[PDB]
Design a protein around this ligand. Structure first.
Ligand SMILES: CC(=O)c1ccc(Oc2ccc(-c3ccc(-c4ccccc4Cl)n3CC(=O)NC(=N)N)cc2)cc1
Length: 370
């Protein structure tokens, strides 16, 4: 039942949403980051200063070694581990147990986050981007193959709303919970099964079209990513967007470090002038040619709580992170190669504006992919 899965996500603002999982026999409880922008199930398996708990393979009767290492360097650090399999469950998820691949992290730097309360990562994206290669079956693929769970999951990320603020939400595995959204679910095609790749066809700031070639919005790629805090935009788009937001919020201005997402800006106890900041609409490619729909977010989404500007520049394409997802109920319909969006039952809004999902809008689109 989906009711058992409601509110199964927790986290600290800007530090990642996690779900409780167990690994091994007897079950070892760990908190695991939900990441739709990666494809490995990887868990701390050795002491680390930021780890209060870790996976202990020697304690599991059902652990099997694959005699294979994995090494993942990136700009700023790395994680390194040993591959194996073991029994895995999600206590507040489906009532099943799966033998899944596990990367046992033995060494790392700048991977784990101080105070985040998670000990591992659940990469929910596709095999193409799994490390060390695509032969390492991702967790969700194993789950679908070994059980009768439908090939679909959904995410309701709720944020904070009124120490780092606590965030919460729900991961519904194997279906759609109608109580978690209002109005209609609109679907955009998954362009290619690697990341959850999508196509943005139009973007406006307070109803004003940025008027760019739509290739620019997907310059390199556009993805839906629970593992990213910000709405990340390609250089040309970012600059165009901040110019427009600055103009709309001209009545009293802010320092440059704010717009660079580096330094905070404060008011006091419910005095925040939300109505000065514009709404942002992303138009996504629809299921039918010449047809699109829009998702509209509020400053409450893109000003992360004192606030930091949660829109930042990207060199790797558009990343629709928590900023975008927190307005909406997001369906990752893997079976039908599409991503659904609907207004979330939990999204933060005021008495003048709301997050919105609206369509259809006609856009004449196939060549917006880069
Ligand atoms: C607020 C919000 O929602 C939030 C905030 C902080 C978060 O913390 C982290 C922690 C570790 C990683 C990481 C290191 C190495 C990798 C990695 C890289 C290549 C292949 C496989 C992996 Cl595991 N990853 C995953 C990653 O790059 N994911 C993605 N870009 N979506 C990424 C993010 C997550 C979410």
């Amino acid at each position: 039942s989906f009711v058992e899965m409601v509110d199964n996500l927790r986290g600290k603002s800007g530090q990642g949403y996690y779900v409780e999982m167990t690994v091994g026999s007897p079950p070892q409880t760990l908190n695991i980051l939900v990441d739709t922008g990666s494809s490995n199930f990887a868990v701390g398996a050795a002491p680390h200063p930021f780890l209060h708990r870790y996976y202990q393979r020697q304690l599991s009767s059902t652990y099997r070694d694959l005699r294979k290492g994995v090494y993942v360097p990136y700009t700023q650090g790395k994680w390194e581990g040993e591959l194996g399999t073991d029994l895995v469950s999600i206590p507040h998820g489906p009532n099943v147990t799966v033998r899944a691949n596990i990367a046992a992290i033995t060494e790392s730097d700048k991977f784990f986050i101080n105070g985040s309360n998670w000990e591992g990562i659940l990469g929910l994206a596709y095999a193409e981007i799994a490390r060390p290669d695509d032969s390492l079956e991702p967790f969700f693929d194993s789950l679908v193959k070994q059980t009768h769970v439908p090939n679909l999951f959904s995410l309701q990320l709720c944020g904070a709303g009124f120490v780092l603020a606590s965030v919460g939400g729900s991961m519904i595995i194997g279906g759609i919970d109608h109580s978690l959204y209002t109005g209609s679910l609109w679907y955009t095609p998954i362009r290619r099964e690697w990341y959850y790749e999508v196509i943005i066809v139009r973007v406006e700031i307070n109803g004003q079209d940025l008027k760019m070639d739509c290739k620019e919005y997907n310059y390199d790629k556009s993805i839906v990513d629970s593992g990213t805090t910000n709405l990340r935009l390609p250089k040309k788009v970012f600059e165009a967007a901040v110019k427009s937001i600055k103009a709309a919020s001209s009545t009293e201005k802010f320092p440059d470090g704010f717009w660079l997402g580096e330094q905070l800006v404060c008011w006091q106890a419910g005095t925040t002038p939300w109505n000065i900041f514009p709404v942002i609409s992303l138009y996504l490619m629809g299921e039918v040619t010449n047809q699109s729909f829009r998702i509209t977010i509020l400053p409450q989404q893109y000003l992360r709580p004192c606030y930091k500007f949660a829109i930042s520049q990207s060199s790797t394409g558009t990343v629709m992170g928590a900023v975008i997802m927190e307005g909406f109920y997001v369906v990752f319909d893997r079976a039908r190669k599409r991503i659904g969006f609907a207004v979330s039952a939990c999204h933060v809004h005021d008495e003048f504006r709301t997050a919105a999902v609206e369509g259809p809008f006609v856009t004449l689109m196939e060549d917006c992919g880069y």
